[PDB]
């Protein structure tokens, strides 16, 4: 589903551009386009194709969310939600007002919602997730390190693939794994736990478990000095 445009001499733009309607295309600007498309420029058969295509900015993953959260005008949402107080009665009040409890709490604190997204993952000081040498020239170490490793590895690889200008499908795949890797670090096992390949199918202790203890808690107990 394209639109062909023959040309005699000159040819502005090249194959892969986003154009139209009515954009300079070839021959001193004698050939214009008609509908929004994607340029193809046929080398041999003197014709440029415009393939029916818009320039949609639709995205996936946290990058997509972060944006929405950045552009979100809370001042204006607060007014807008107060404008749904018993307007469809018990229906959309009961619901879309627990929505306001959040908005307000953000406004009172001065915390950009965006911040819920991470673009820099912090790292716990090494001395308390140590790498001790024990008996027998063998080592003991926290699971965090192994959680942190695999995250670093996937980030670094993602950098390479992006630097390579790899196909967006193998990039998605990477981004998926990265998101998961971050999940696994912060609060492991809220999506089917990861384990140390050998040892056993014992799930790795995440930060969240290390903080509170996985045992529901913080009681139970495990509590005393």
């Amino acid at each position: 589903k394209a639109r062909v445009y023959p040309f005699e001499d000159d040819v502005e733009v090249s194959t892969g551009d986003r154009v139209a309607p009515g954009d300079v295309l070839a021959d001193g600007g004698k050939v214009k386009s008609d509908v929004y498309g994607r340029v193809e420029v046929d080398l041999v058969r003197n014709v440029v194709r415009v393939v029916e295509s818009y320039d949609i900015d639709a995205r996936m993953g946290a990058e997509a969310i972060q944006q929405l959260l950045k552009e979100l005008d809370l001042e204006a949402l607060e007014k807008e939600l107060l404008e749904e107080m018993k307007h469809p009665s018990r229906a959309r009040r009961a619901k879309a007002r627990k929505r306001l409890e959040v908005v307000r709490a953000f406004l009172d604190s001065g915390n950009r919602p965006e911040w819920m997204i991470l673009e820099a993952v912090p790292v716990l000081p090494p001395d308390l997730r140590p790498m001790v040498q024990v008996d027998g020239g063998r080592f003991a170490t926290s699971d965090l390190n192994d959680l942190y490793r695999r995250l670093i590895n996937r980030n670094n690889r993602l950098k390479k693939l992006l630097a390579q200008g790899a196909p967006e499908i193998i990039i998605r795949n990477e981004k998926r794994m990265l998101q998961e890797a971050v999940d696994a670090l912060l609060d492991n096992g809220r999506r089917g736990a990861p384990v140390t390949n050998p040892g056993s199918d014992r799930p790795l202790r995440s930060l969240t478990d290390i903080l509170s203890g996985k045992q529901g808690r913080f009681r139970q107990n495990l509590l005393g000095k």
Binding site: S14, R59, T141, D143, P167, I170
Partner: protein, 351 residues
Amino acid sequence: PKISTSDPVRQYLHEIGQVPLLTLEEEVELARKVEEGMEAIKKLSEITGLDPDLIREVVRAKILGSARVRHIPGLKETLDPKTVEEIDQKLKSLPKEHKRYLHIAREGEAARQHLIEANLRLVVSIAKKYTGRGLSFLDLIQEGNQGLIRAVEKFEYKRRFKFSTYATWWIRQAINRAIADQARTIRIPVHMVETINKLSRTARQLQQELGREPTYEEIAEAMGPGWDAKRVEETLKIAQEPVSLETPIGDEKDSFYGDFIPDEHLPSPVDAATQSLLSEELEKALSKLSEREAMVLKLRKGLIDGREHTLEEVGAFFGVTRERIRQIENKALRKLKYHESRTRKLRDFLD
């Protein structure tokens, strides 16, 4: 609502959707278009004078970039502003004879994308074999995927080899290399994964050859020429997991391995209190001394370095050097023995 929880692999195995039907004809054409592209980028930086890698960046930008022009390019490393337009407006404002190389270059980068996508299934089938070897299936796939990029970078179509079974190699390479690097917590050299894997190979024969688990001497003879009782042992030590601090102990619920490991770094109230007093009492000791003398020992030990001869060279910054400083140590140390034998302060610190 915990439905689509563990998709990952199933999810990614939707690239059946990207039509893998690659005829020889289509395979060759794409490969050809890649090559002619790579060459065009040379002709370009030859004509423009710009860096070839920098051009390829801009060609990639104009094909991929629409929502792929990264909003954070590594915090000001790659520049994604109007510098790309400026480059493209340069290339586009070339005469016909040269400008054709731009169009060749664009096609090429478009052809790369397809040629890679077409063979993603190939990676999966190869990576399917390397599982469990210490690295997640998805990790292996991605690792192998870059093997496939490189294979496309290297492949020459003029030699009519089947791209499939060519790339095969490069994919295998990147995977194996990944395992040697990433699989272990304490990173190890590759020729050391080699050997470790070679030992756990020979342990298999030597078990069933003998019946019993082989002695170390047994497994060394088998290993070859550089090998030794001590070496087999000292190796396997290195070969191990290692142990998780978060490993529970017997009672399971309350105790963990880590709980039992004691700090031997930081000095305990008794220790700390000592060496602090020592500092104070040594001062009180070498205070009543010649100021020049006191520094000698403080520069023979008292600051930082053993000073076998180094101090004896730069003779207390300025002063008579070597065999006459040897004499000062003697009298300074012996001057302390006068005092110490009488006022027993320092005696007790000798444990």
